[PDB]
Design an enzyme around this catalytic site. Structure first.
Site, PDB file in Angstrom:
ATOM      1  N   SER B  14      15.170 -13.015  11.323  1.00 12.07           N
ATOM      2  CA  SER B  14      14.073 -13.198  10.204  1.00 12.07           C
ATOM      3  C   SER B  14      14.176 -14.338   9.633  1.00 12.07           C
ATOM      4  CB  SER B  14      13.784 -11.749   9.683  1.00 12.07           C
ATOM      5  OG  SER B  14      14.977 -11.475   9.091  1.00 12.07           O
ATOM      6  N   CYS B 379       1.140 -13.046 -18.155  1.00 12.20           N
ATOM      7  CA  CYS B 379       1.352 -11.821 -18.507  1.00 12.20           C
ATOM      8  C   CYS B 379       2.493 -11.420 -19.642  1.00 12.20           C
ATOM      9  CB  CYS B 379       1.510 -11.033 -17.071  1.00 12.20           C
ATOM     10  SG  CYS B 379       0.869  -9.300 -17.012  1.00 12.20           S
ATOM     11  N   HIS B 504      -3.132 -13.355 -13.822  1.00 11.55           N
ATOM     12  CA  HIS B 504      -1.828 -14.225 -13.078  1.00 11.55           C
ATOM     13  C   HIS B 504      -2.743 -15.386 -12.430  1.00 11.55           C
ATOM     14  CE1 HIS B 504       1.813 -11.607 -12.919  1.00 11.55           C
ATOM     15  NE2 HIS B 504       0.958 -10.776 -13.172  1.00 11.55           N
ATOM     16  N   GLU B 506      -1.640 -18.147 -11.364  1.00 12.01           N
ATOM     17  CA  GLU B 506      -0.868 -18.567  -9.946  1.00 12.01           C
ATOM     18  C   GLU B 506      -1.435 -18.173  -8.659  1.00 12.01           C
ATOM     19  OE1 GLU B 506       0.212 -16.460 -12.066  1.00 12.01           O
ATOM     20  OE2 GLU B 506       1.703 -15.145 -11.339  1.00 12.01           O
TER      21      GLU B 506
HETATM   22  N1  LIG Z   1      18.133  -1.702  15.381  1.00 12.09           N
HETATM   23  C1  LIG Z   1      17.359  -2.038  14.309  1.00 12.09           C
HETATM   24  C2  LIG Z   1      18.243  -2.794  12.966  1.00 12.09           C
HETATM   25  C3  LIG Z   1      17.582  -2.730  11.954  1.00 12.09           C
HETATM   26  N2  LIG Z   1      16.165  -2.723  11.805  1.00 12.09           N
HETATM   27  C4  LIG Z   1      15.441  -2.931  10.557  1.00 12.09           C
HETATM   28  O1  LIG Z   1      15.953  -4.347  10.080  1.00 12.09           O
HETATM   29  C5  LIG Z   1      15.323  -4.601   8.948  1.00 12.09           C
HETATM   30  C6  LIG Z   1      15.852  -5.483   8.282  1.00 12.09           C
HETATM   31  O2  LIG Z   1      15.627  -6.790   9.025  1.00 12.09           O
HETATM   32  P1  LIG Z   1      16.785  -8.284   9.219  1.00 12.09           P
HETATM   33  O3  LIG Z   1      17.124  -8.669   7.666  1.00 12.09           O
HETATM   34  O4  LIG Z   1      15.816  -9.014   9.960  1.00 12.09           O
HETATM   35  O5  LIG Z   1      17.674  -7.466   9.777  1.00 12.09           O
HETATM   36  P2  LIG Z   1      19.277  -7.465   9.383  1.00 12.09           P
HETATM   37  O6  LIG Z   1      20.108  -6.010   9.772  1.00 12.09           O
HETATM   38  O7  LIG Z   1      19.526  -7.738   7.960  1.00 12.09           O
HETATM   39  O8  LIG Z   1      20.141  -8.559   9.783  1.00 12.09           O
HETATM   40  P3  LIG Z   1      20.109  -9.930   9.415  1.00 12.09           P
HETATM   41  O9  LIG Z   1      21.696 -10.300   9.195  1.00 12.09           O
HETATM   42  O10 LIG Z   1      20.054 -10.845  10.684  1.00 12.09           O
HETATM   43  O11 LIG Z   1      19.122 -10.205   8.384  1.00 12.09           O
HETATM   44  C7  LIG Z   1      15.370  -3.036   8.314  1.00 12.09           C
HETATM   45  O12 LIG Z   1      14.049  -2.809   7.653  1.00 12.09           O
HETATM   46  C8  LIG Z   1      15.477  -2.105   9.453  1.00 12.09           C
HETATM   47  O13 LIG Z   1      14.635  -0.907   9.373  1.00 12.09           O
HETATM   48  C9  LIG Z   1      15.436  -2.065  13.161  1.00 12.09           C
HETATM   49  O14 LIG Z   1      14.268  -1.973  13.187  1.00 12.09           O
HETATM   50  N3  LIG Z   1      16.266  -1.730  14.007  1.00 12.09           N
HETATM   51  N1  LIG Z   2       3.359  -8.369 -14.277  1.00 14.37           N
HETATM   52  C1  LIG Z   2       3.535  -8.441 -15.396  1.00 14.37           C
HETATM   53  O1  LIG Z   2       3.871  -9.352 -16.069  1.00 14.37           O
HETATM   54  C2  LIG Z   2       3.645  -7.062 -16.193  1.00 14.37           C
HETATM   55  C3  LIG Z   2       3.299  -7.262 -17.789  1.00 14.37           C
HETATM   56  C4  LIG Z   2       3.576  -5.840 -18.423  1.00 14.37           C
HETATM   57  N2  LIG Z   2       4.788  -5.187 -18.001  1.00 14.37           N
HETATM   58  C5  LIG Z   2       2.535  -4.770 -18.202  1.00 14.37           C
HETATM   59  O2  LIG Z   2       2.444  -3.804 -17.334  1.00 14.37           O
HETATM   60  O3  LIG Z   2       1.364  -4.981 -18.862  1.00 14.37           O
END
Ligand SMILES: Nc1ccn([C@@H]2O[C@H](COP(=O)(O)OP(=O)(O)OP(=O)(O)O)[C@@H](O)[C@H]2O)c(=O)n1
Ligand SMILES: NC(=O)CC[C@H](N)C(=O)O
Ligand SMILES: Nc1ccn([C@@H]2O[C@H](COP(=O)(O)OP(=O)(O)OP(=O)(O)O)[C@@H](O)[C@H]2O)c(=O)n1
Ligand SMILES: NC(=O)CC[C@H](N)C(=O)O
Ligand SMILES: NC(=O)CC[C@H](N)C(=O)O
Ligand SMILES: [Mg+2]
Ligand SMILES: [Mg+2]
Ligand SMILES: [Mg+2]
Lengths: 535, 532, 535
Positions: B14, B379, B504, B506
């Protein structure tokens, strides 16, 4: 004492460093006083690498007993003091070829001959024959878990493990843990998926070796353990290092061999890595620098010269000289002339087959003899040097090897039974393996090897033409070694030169980082000597 | 006008760039005149990212209609002009949640409710809802092919492809092709293995997008094609680039959009990437430089501020100014003091929740109002500006927000229900909201209009009862809502450039169209840098 | 006209009826006037089944050109009128054996030889050679999707499909749909999972043939379509039927060939299944019943006699006689005596190798000659009958075949170059394939085959000993056919008997249900005649 097997597999990608990882692990075990060996199983169909070009999977390594094998056996012999033989390397071709020969001659008594059990039985039998009387046997499986070609290997070792029991077998699996720039982390996913592929073939790895370009942190090691049913301590990090000699100490510092000895129930003293630390220290502390030109036809894949490049590196170690190896296409000599040899402290011309690029080597041998630049010629490089000397000093115009122009007037190098005169008169089968060679009483090499008789390894068919020999000696050239019988020439020296040696045998296959090699050490000393008188 | 889907998946690892890859592809298609959209299916269980920490999957992006969604929707909106709404993002959590409710209430008529077809049906309906009335719909599947979490997404789309037909669906699968130093080669083995996992789930990819840190040479592309049943022309290379703005171009030069138009049988003029070319050119040729400090609590994961970081970069483009963003932990203004604000040509304080590090932000807003350094406060950043002011120029001791210290004498920021005064006397916004600009403000100027539309995600408002008191002591009210005239924008008018706002901004900034506040803000930062 | 390929694979289990399903489909296509052929790819390591016992994978079938092949080729020739040759059957052994021979002689120019592309290339080349100039080629893949042994086959055909295009290739996959008593339904799960295995190898099946012991209802067919990415109409049901001759009509009635012709874009008239309907009608309407005893050494696996059992069945069809085939261990004759032959209307002694059970056959040949029970002897069964006659009528005590007692006094059957007298005097190499045979002017068989010359197929090495021949003719026995040259004896008749014929060739390999076979039709008529005079 029962034999134990550690099976080494790789996943995700190839070029992962399985050979080197196995060899290093073997080196550690060796240093705990265990009797260790290693073997390579290659998935290729070739019966043996004897028919493979050096640009296919690199150099064709040769063991004492004359087997043509994978270059991994070079790595093995350079990390442990065991000698490899035919027994330590076989391919799928060799397996199928044995089984076909037995089937066709009726040895299976009318049975259907099948991948299982017949191919797999065959594989198990050679694995047992390679392990015979060793305490630990590392069995390296070529190819990558998940592909088609190595499946019978994996099924064979699966069977062995159940048969022999987990008391005496471990599975060590290498995988890739790539770094992602966008996220700044290394990734465990391919390891997770590779281990599921390996499981789907029926093998639970016991140890995970994590290859990356940097260490694999604890967080991700724990994640791998969690998903691969392996305890944390069996998930080992193996980063890209600047020196392979550090690998044993790196693995040791993470318990890998402790973990193995515990699983196999061996009391063995802690590994003593002094020889490695010494090699590492030597490497880290050069006193000076040289530049050696390696000039040949296969420089597009350097592994074609794997053991030569390492022998040079060991020559560096024995002289505390850092060798800068510069690879030079010998065919560019033909095109661009002697120009591209400017700036060299020594010159090595390695082995080869086929005329393409050989005239550039002959020229190269010349330039080095004329300008007094030190020269080492191995096999072909000894042949092109005989050729150089004849043409340019014994004035035998156009002299050559029957391998290249079969009908030339002065075939100075030719098959023994092609031998002829410049007039056409005559007198009234690859050489493989370790052969004894007699050293000539007043030669450079008799002093360097310091014994009257040495053992080196051959892989060549074209010999020095004895019928044109006297005429070349008469012009200056000296014979420095011959075989045992039929006196064929193994070594030549040009004695009007600081350092000019060439040999038929491959001395690079007996060079190691711990014990070095007298020829290379000499060659490198000379390069250093020569470098220092130009400065 | 049959609707066409392109299902985008990811293999090997990922953090592959699926969002950006998909967004870029969409950008090319829009440039060929096609009506296009994108949506994100996230495999997580949170019903929506509203309860997610900004250090978990990054910023919570907010759409016009006030949905809280994955940051990928920010990328989408910054590559195409179609507006995302809540139908362009849903999680597994949202899917199970709807099915559970329907089931407890009896809508399934006593059927056994199953992953297939009930969960997969629910996924299909939502993919159809997000797609309706569009020519091409990019459906980005979160997670990695091979894992458990995204399998129901994968089975639902497999079904859709078969229902809708191969003439209106494409599968684009991203993979990693790593470089091995040992051999000097990029390696196709992982791609070959990932396409196998995908096929085993019943999906034959149609297009392979090959990520690597360098281009994938024709040899390796040809080998991927041989092993994966895709023709070579549909094996595309997408190297790490130095600017995402070049990705539409890089893909188009390899024929990707032609391949798609051919498979979906569309005649569309060639893509006109001129706006992107302009953007690349601006980014490549800055004339000045600035360092801008971003001071806040989430700097450990920069994606926490993904849209702000980008809106600054767009501020860069519009002034041909290269912006260095120095991320600064506002907890460190607390420990190590105002020194760490040394060397900035401007200061931006972004949004956030929780007291930790807010005292640092108030010191920070002061430093800038005081030493005439340009300041943008979004914000939280606008709120901590008012705190600074009232607290240091209207002398309202220890003034604060009820969010942080509820019983403070001076609650200048407080829920509307909490609105009191210093004696105790009396009398969550999401989405696109109209804001009214005060006729003589630095902001009626920059926006060059009376009324504007910007997006909210916040609970705490400026206390109107404490307001007239802070106005007298200097501060200026630059914009306000519709009813309740809540304060949306404040300016300190004895400063070169001091703006702060509740919304926001952005979320509306793009690289093609810039943003008036960030253009303004970056311009001011440049002017300031020149004066030193 | 472009060649089209239909690849036939099987999943879940083996013994699924792939051969028969393919052959039936071919029969339908044939009847649409298309030029069709079929080939079998076996995953065994044997170079060819020539070294396989008949109890391994059944009979070793022989084509006209002398190839020893899998019995599936029998099924092919009995459903379409094409002639099989070496081209229509190869094994993994044959593939590996070709590639090894080329690698060892240097034909790969130093390349690493790999499963892909080298093994797979080899496979593609024979698949193309077998398809050469046919409109449709069914390519049957042995083994089961998911196992190791057939992976290269599957990868080869995957490659072909991409290369040739989906315009001219289809994948037809058989799976098992088992009935569960507890629930009273047939199950689609194994089909679902088999199709995912096939996909994981990179092949999307186009057609699903559902094997069950009853029809697969619409509900479950639709479920399979839903999960396998196949349209409903390409999910075909193939229940266990009481007669293989119905299979073409069963598949036709579900559109299978329409679906194929549409995919390959062939205008072809509707299949005319008249010959099949006729065969089916004949089978369904016998007029009487017989019981024929098949007496041999391999009756523990009847497929050892596959083509013989079918020839008998065709003999039934041509006489409207229902043949009850009773298999009898010829070794039980040795133990339990002639007793177990009680109650038989005819007797067939099939071919074989090795002495075990041969004395029981000799005895069996005897009993049938003495009690005037009609007798057909094929190969071995013709040899044991010569042996019977010599011992018991030409009174040559202990006579035998050199195959069994090499040094016996009267070797009546022996290798041509072992030929000798009862005195030891002499005169001054398997026979394979279709050979011409001259029929003797006044013989039963000259009338049955109704031509002076016929072509039948051999697989044997032991011949009728010409040196002891005159002595056996003199005692009554008549020679009914000989070869072309060197006059070896192909057929013998005992003329004092209602019906007693024996031949060296395997006439069962040219028998078919549509066109029958003159020898078997004769043999069965006689059995019916004999049955009716006991009643
Ligand atoms: N057999 C598996 C192992 C992990 N996950 C999912 O993998 C996700 C995390 O994604 P990613 O970071 O891509 O996997 P990692 O295990 O962290 O591996 P990497 O070190 O490559 O990130 C989690 O939500 C978990 O539910 C899954 O669906 N099936
Ligand atoms: N996204 C933010 O900056 C939240 C500002 C503040 N905590 C509020 O709820 O109003
Ligand atoms: N499904 C596959 C694909 C390939 N191979 C084998 O893979 C070997 C090549 O190995 P390697 O170079 O590791 O794989 P590549 O396919 O070249 O991929 P990469 O780009 O990662 O090298 C070949 O001998 C071939 O027999 C296999 O057994 N099964
Ligand atoms: N490896 C080599 O250098 C071989 C040298 C030469 N071609 C021979 O066969 O003798
Ligand atoms: N198939 C057979 O009956 C072979 C018969 C006999 N053993 C031979 O080799 O001649
Ligand atoms: Mg992760
Ligand atoms: Mg490769
Ligand atoms: Mg069910």
């Amino acid at each position: 004492m029962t034999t134990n097997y550690i099976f080494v597999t790789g996943g995700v990608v190839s070029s992962l460093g399985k050979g080197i990882a196995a060899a290093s692990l073997a080196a550690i075990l060796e240093a705990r006083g265990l009797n260790v060996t290693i073997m390579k199983l290659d998935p290729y169909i070739n019966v043996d690498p004897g028919t493979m070009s050096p640009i296919q999977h690199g150099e064709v390594f040769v063991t004492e007993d004359g087997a043509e094998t994978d270059l991994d056996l070079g790595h093995y012999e350079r990390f442990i003091r065991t000698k490899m033989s035919r027994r330590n390397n076989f391919t799928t071709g060799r397996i199928y070829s044995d089984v076909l020969r037995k089937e066709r001659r009726g040895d299976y008594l009318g049975a259907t001959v099948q991948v299982i059990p017949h191919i797999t039985n065959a594989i198990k039998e050679r694995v047992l024959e390679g392990g015979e009387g060793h305490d630990v046997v590392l069995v390296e499986i070529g190819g990558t878990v998940g592909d088609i070609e190595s499946l019978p290997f994996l099924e064979a070792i699966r069977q062995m493990a159940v048969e022999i029991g987990r008391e005496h077998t471990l599975f060590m699996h290498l995988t890739l843990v790539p770094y992602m720039a966008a996220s700044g982390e290394v990734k465990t996913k391919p390891t997770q998926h590779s281990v599921k592929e390996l499981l789907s073939i029926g093998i639970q790895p016991d140890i995970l070796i994590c290859r990356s370009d940097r260490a694999v942190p604890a967080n991700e090691r724990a994640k791998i353990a969690l998903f691969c049913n392996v305890p944390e301590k069996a998930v080992i990090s193996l980063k890209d290092v600047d020196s392979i000699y550090k690998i044993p100490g790196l693995l040791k510092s993470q318990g890998l061999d402790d973990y193995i000895c515990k699983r196999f129930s061996l009391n063995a003293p802690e590994a003593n890595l002094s020889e490695w630390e010494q090699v590492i220290f030597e490497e880290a502390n050069p006193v000076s620098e040289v530049t050696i030109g390696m000039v040949g036809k296969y420089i597009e894949l350097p592994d074609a010269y794997k053991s030569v490049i390492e022998a040079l590196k060991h020559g560096g170690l024995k002289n505390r000289v850092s060798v800068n190896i510069k690879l030079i296409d010998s065919q560019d000599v033909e095109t661009r002339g002697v120009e591209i040899l400017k700036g060299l402290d020594a010159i090595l011309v390695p082995g080869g087959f086929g005329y393409r690029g050989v005239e550039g080597m002959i020229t190269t041998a010349r330039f080095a003899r004329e300008n007094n630049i030190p020269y080492l010629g191995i096999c072909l490089g000894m042949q092109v040097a005989l050729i150089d000397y004849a043409r340019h000093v014994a004035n035998m115009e156009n002299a050559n090897s029957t391998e290249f122009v079969p009908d030339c007037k002065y075939p100075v190098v030719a098959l023994i039974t092609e031998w002829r005169d410049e007039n056409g008169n005559v007198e009234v089968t690859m050489r493989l393996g370790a052969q004894q060679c007699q050293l000539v009483d007043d030669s450079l090499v008799r002093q360097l090897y310091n014994a009257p008789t040495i053992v080196e390894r051959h892989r060549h068919r074209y010999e020095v033409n004895n019928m044109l020999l006297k005429q070349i000696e008469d012009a200056g050239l000296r014979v420095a070694g011959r075989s045992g019988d039929d006196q064929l020439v193994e070594i030549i020296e040009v004695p009007n030169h600081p350092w000019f040696v060439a040999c038929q045998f491959h001395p690079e296959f007996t060079s190691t980082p711990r014990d070095g090699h007298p020829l290379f050490a000499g060659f490198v000393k000379a390069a250093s000597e020569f470098q220092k008188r130009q400065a």
